[PDB]
Amino acid sequence: MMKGYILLEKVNIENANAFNNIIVGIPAITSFLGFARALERKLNAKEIAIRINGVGLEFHEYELKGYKNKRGQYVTSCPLPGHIMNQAYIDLNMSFLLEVEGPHVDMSTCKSIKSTMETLRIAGGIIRNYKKIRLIDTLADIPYGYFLTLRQDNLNDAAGDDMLDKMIHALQQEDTLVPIAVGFKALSEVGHVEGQRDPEKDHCFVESIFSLGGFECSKILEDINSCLWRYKTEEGLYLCTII
């Protein structure tokens, strides 16, 4: 049960779903950690037996599909359907840091991740290219990027009546704060409603929950867990956090 950190450097996602209802741009972090559970699901489909517990996101470069107008407000661009439902897309040169624990962490499982990730998509976006997949030992072994930490303390200690009002007040104080999508809150009790993806899984209608996150520099960040995301499932409150 050795624990190791695997860095996927310069992953170029093209046309990831930037639209997340009230949030357009940074995709839902549930996409970026369901990439980890898909990359573990297909690895335990093979004989690798890796259980990924946390994933840290470093957003190195970004581009939103659309054009800047005269005023400054963007206009998003979408594919032409074969009635256009609300949708928008983003390209992300971002690097993953995977906390991996299991039988053993070695360079051969980096080659296995190298083989496996080239059939995967992150947030519905294809992978053009990758720089390197390397096991890191310290914060120094991480290139210059900007991690996405969950600054929930800024949203909690914010002046307002409702928490939206608090978020509007929070984005009007610090500028590096970005409102990000984290998890899904239950809207109904679980059960076998008809018309599912896979009939055997229990199914629950949900609603996306949202929070406020911040960008922390590479050699300014303290610790590695402080930038690692994890899945937590309270009863009716599925969500990914930083603890």
Partner: protein, 322 residues
């Protein structure tokens, strides 16, 4: 025995095409020169040129308004456009991202395995990379040129360059050994014998000094009312969707071909966007062919199988009506 189609069946794309990135080079020195090609802006004036009744024409002829129109053009010094795009292909048996009934999944696995030992996705691969060979991924950029050279690289091996202005767009050729070897590569990586194949294609087109390069127009859905092109990383490029639709025009089996004699891109009801009437309305479609393959086990003519396993390579939401 099955009774219907599933409720959440969704294949994914088996021929993922990355976004093209346009560059401007000179033919004599094209293996080194690679200057960025940017999206410049110009001011056009509205011509007001639609049909309108002959009484009111003095109103909308004498009040024009300027519209800022993004236009892409080459430099005076450089005379070739360099379209660089990528391709990632995955096997179709694994492209079934979502499925509901396991009996259906076993049936479609068995039918794909039945085609896989019959032809083994060769003719599909010939046509898909033949569209690379004709360079239809230069939609209106190829209506006049001299030597449109397509150079295709697999892994680290650069396959021989192909002069696209010797292959007709309406006649698919199956004799070329480069096309045969590359189609065997895409066929074996489409079968499941391989699990991934990257294909990087660089195309050089001699449109001439200072002439116009046409990139993909961004859907503004906003008002402006101006031609706005796609600026990828500050440079021109095609919307990858267009690239996949260009490589996808392989259907020469649509009903009533002897009369029309032109290949159309594969969709469900055979709806190409040049001809308004759907070419494949009923008793030749996707939905009434898997019903006529899986729901009622019966062998189909091999052209039908080529079509339906072409759109199965496309991906989309093949499902029930609910």
């Amino acid at each position: 025995t099955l009774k219907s189609r599933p409720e959440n069946l969704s294949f994914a794309r088996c021929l993922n095409t990355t976004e093209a990135k346009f560059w401007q080079t000179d033919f004599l020195k094209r293996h080194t020169f690679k200057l960025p090609l940017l999206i410049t802006d110009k001011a056009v004036l509205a011509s007001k040129g639609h049909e309108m009744p002959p009484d009111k024409l003095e109103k909308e002829i004498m009040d024009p308004n300027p519209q800022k129109s993004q236009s892409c053009t080459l430099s005076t010094e450089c005379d070739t456009l360099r379209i660089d795009f990528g391709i990632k292909v995955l096997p179709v048996k694994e492209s079934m991202y979502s499925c509901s009934d396991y009996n259906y999944r076993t049936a479609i696995y068995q039918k794909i395995d039945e085609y896989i030992a019959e032809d083994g996705f060769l003719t599909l691969a010939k046509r898909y990379v033949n569209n690379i060979a004709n360079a239809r991924f230069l939609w209106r950029n190829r209506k006049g040129a001299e030597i449109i050279e397509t150079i295709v690289t697999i892994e680290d091996k650069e396959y021989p360059s192909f002069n696209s202005k010797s292959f007709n767009l309406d006649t698919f050729v199956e004799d070329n050994a480069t096309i045969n070897e590359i189609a065997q590569q895409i066929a074996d990586t489409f079968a499941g014998k391989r699990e991934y194949l990257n294909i990087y294609v660089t195309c050089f087109v001699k449109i001439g000094c200072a002439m116009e390069v046409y990139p993909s127009q961004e859907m503004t859905f906003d008002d402006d009312k101006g031609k706005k092109l796609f600026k990828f990383e500050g440079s021109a490029g095609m919307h990858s969707q267009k690239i996949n639709n260009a490589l996808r025009t392989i259907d020469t089996w649509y009903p009533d071909y002897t009369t029309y004699e032109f290949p159309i891109p594969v969709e469900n009801y055979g709806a190409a966007r040049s001809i308004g009437i759907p070419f494949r309305p009923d008793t030749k479609s996707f939905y009434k062919l898997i019903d006529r393959m899986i729901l009622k086990n019966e062998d189909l003519p091999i052209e039908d199988k080529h079509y339906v396993m072409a759109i199965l390579i496309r991906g989309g939401m093949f499902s029930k009506k609910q």
